Structures are given as structure tokens and as C-alpha cells.
Design an enzyme around this catalytic site. Structure first.
Site, PDB file in Angstrom:
ATOM      1  N   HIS A  62       0.811  -1.130  -0.055  1.00  0.00           N
ATOM      2  CA  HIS A  62       0.120  -0.084  -0.103  1.00  0.00           C
ATOM      3  C   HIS A  62       0.812   1.243  -0.071  1.00  0.00           C
ATOM      4  CE1 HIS A  62      -3.187  -2.816   1.147  1.00  0.00           C
ATOM      5  NE2 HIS A  62      -2.538  -3.199   2.203  1.00  0.00           N
ATOM      6  N   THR A 196      -6.084   6.676   8.031  1.00  0.00           N
ATOM      7  CA  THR A 196      -6.843   6.849   6.865  1.00  0.00           C
ATOM      8  C   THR A 196      -6.601   5.729   5.848  1.00  0.00           C
ATOM      9  OG1 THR A 196      -4.682   7.833   5.864  1.00  0.00           O
ATOM     10  CG2 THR A 196      -6.277   9.519   7.043  1.00  0.00           C
ATOM     11  N   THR A 197      -6.070   4.808   6.588  1.00  0.00           N
ATOM     12  CA  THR A 197      -6.103   3.318   5.847  1.00  0.00           C
ATOM     13  C   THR A 197      -6.899   2.256   6.716  1.00  0.00           C
ATOM     14  OG1 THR A 197      -4.019   2.766   6.735  1.00  0.00           O
ATOM     15  CG2 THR A 197      -3.991   3.507   4.467  1.00  0.00           C
TER      16      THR A 197
END
Ligand SMILES: [Hg+2]
Ligand SMILES: [Zn+2]
Length: 258
Positions: A62, A196-197
């Protein structure tokens, strides 16, 4: 399937596996500078990174993480809106496929080329895993990156990217000093939010610095050569690994400056 940033597993699909994606204190958010409340009682930030000990750099499919030894108060954050000492555990970036996008938080709707996240956990909780069970368990320092002149203190990270091109690879990365990534000014905006993930946990006190740092075009280009995929799989460039702005709802953004 596993979450990501593609049309089929991107930010708009996250809620199916992580219902909190539609929660009440989600990040990132747009920072409206005219609506932010100057709070004169906000104390200056205290960044103590002189005894920082980096260990490894890893591509997780990611983004890439630079991990630090957080077994002792080596690199801590305190002051500002924080109560208690917060330990640096890792930092990573979010960047775009083009210079006009890449940051998660925006200022008056403006998107920067990238955004650096220095993650810290509240020592009162013993370890990172316990910290993520508390409303004030984490503190993330956000730093915008704009394209301009090269940031000398970022080159060491840029040079190692070659060896961790694909998902799952890691490389020893000792003696990296995170102070070389800091802007001159420590003025910031702060509000309560989340990671935020996925798992998108609502345990973060965000501290977003007003002053961005500049990196060269060549430096950012190197980030874009990373791969989302594992080796032996079709190449999928690691770009646009950022989440869009979320509704502010019942939250107020406070500024440490006027
Ligand atoms: Hg939490
Ligand atoms: Zn992040």
C-alpha cells in the site's frame, strides 16, 4: 478481496469491510483556514527526535514504512494539543501519480504532491496495540510536500527504494534521522480523527503542520516507481495511495497560530 486504491477495492468500497469508514471522526478532512479557530491556549509542539533509532524500511503493498525502535522514549512527541508522551513508531507517505494530487488533507481544497505521516502512540497505554483501543491513543504529525528544490534529508530514503520495489520486501535502514524531514516552522492545525487506511480506527489526534517541505521532481518520481504488487505478478505502480476528504461532521479544527 483485499482493500486497496483501485476501482474495485478502493476508498469507496472500504465501508463494506470496515463499517467505521462512515464513522463520526474520519480522516482526512479539508482544512478551511477561515473557519479554523485560533486557540491561544495551544502550547508549542515538542519534537524530541535526537535519540531516534530507525531499523527497517518495508513495502507493505500500500505504502512504504520506515520503522523505529519504540521500546524506550527515544523519539517522542509532546506539547501542542497533547497530554502525555507519544512514541514514534513509524512514518510513511501518500503520493499521487501527478504533482497536483497526492496529499490526504487539503488546505482550502488545495492538494499537495504528497503527505508525510509520522505515527506516534500514547505511552500511557504500554504498546501500540493497546493504544489503538483508546480515543487518544495515537498522534499523527502530518507534513505536506510540494515539488520544488530537493530535500537533502530525504535522499537516503529515496536511494533505498530500489531494494524494496515490490510488496513484502524490506531492507535494514539504520541511523536515519527524521529531523531532516521537518519544516522550519512548527505552527499547526489540530482536530480529532482516525487512521486513513483500514482499519480506519478513530484514535488519532491529528497535528497538521502549516508549512510544507519541498522535494525535487526527481525525488517524487522515485516514489512512483514502487509497486503495489508482489514480484512475479503483473506490474501495478504504487501511485495515488491517498484517501479522499471525509465530512467534518461535529468537529472543529483549531489553529496554533493567527
Ligand atoms: Hg480508538
Ligand atoms: Zn498515512
Amino acid at each position: 478481496h483485499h482493500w486497496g486504491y483501485g476501482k474495485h477495492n478502493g476508498p469507496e468500497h472500504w465501508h463494506k469491510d470496515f463499517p467505521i469508514a462512515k464513522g463520526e471522526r474520519q480522516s482526512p478532512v479539508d482544512i478551511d483556514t477561515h473557519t479554523a479557530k485560533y486557540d491561544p491556549s495551544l502550547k508549542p509542539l515538542s519534537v524530541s527526535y535526537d535519540q531516534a533509532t530507525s531499523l527497517r524500511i518495508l513495502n507493505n503493498g500500500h505504502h512504504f514504512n520506515v520503522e523505529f525502535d519504540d521500546s524506550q522514549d527515544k523519539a517522542v512527541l509532546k506539547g501542542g494539543p497533547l497530554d502525555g508522551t507519544y512514541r514514534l513508531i513509524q512514518f510513511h507517505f501518500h503520493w499521487g501519480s501527478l504533482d497536483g494530487q497526492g496529499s490526504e488533507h487539503t488546505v482550502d481544497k488545495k492538494k499537495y504532491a504528497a503527505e508525510l505521516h509520522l505515527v506516534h502512540w500514547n505511552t500511557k497505554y504500554g504498546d501500540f496495540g493497546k493504544a489503538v483501543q483508546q480515543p487518544d491513543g495515537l498522534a499523527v504529525l502530518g507534513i505536506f510536500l510540494k515539488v520544488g528544490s530537493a530535500k537533502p534529508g530525504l535522499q537516503k530514503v529515496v536511494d533505498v527504494l530500489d531494494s524494496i520495489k515490490t510488496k513484502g520486501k524490506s531492507a535494514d535502514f539504520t541511523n536515519f534521522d527524521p529531523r531532516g524531514l521537518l519544516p522550519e516552522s512548527l505552527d499547526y492545525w489540530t482536530y480529532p480523527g482516525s487512521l486513513t487506511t483500514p482499519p480506519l480506527l478513530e484514535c488519532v489526534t491529528w497535528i497538521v503542520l502549516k508549512e510544507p517541505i519541498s522535494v525535487s521532481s526527481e525525488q517524487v518520481l522515485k516514489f512512483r516507481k514502487l509497486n503495489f504488487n508482489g514480484e512475479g505478478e503483473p506490474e501495478e505502480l504504487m501511485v495515488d495511495n491517498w484517501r479522499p476528504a471525509q465530512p467534518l461532521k461535529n468537529r472543529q479544527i483549531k489553529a496554533s497560530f493567527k
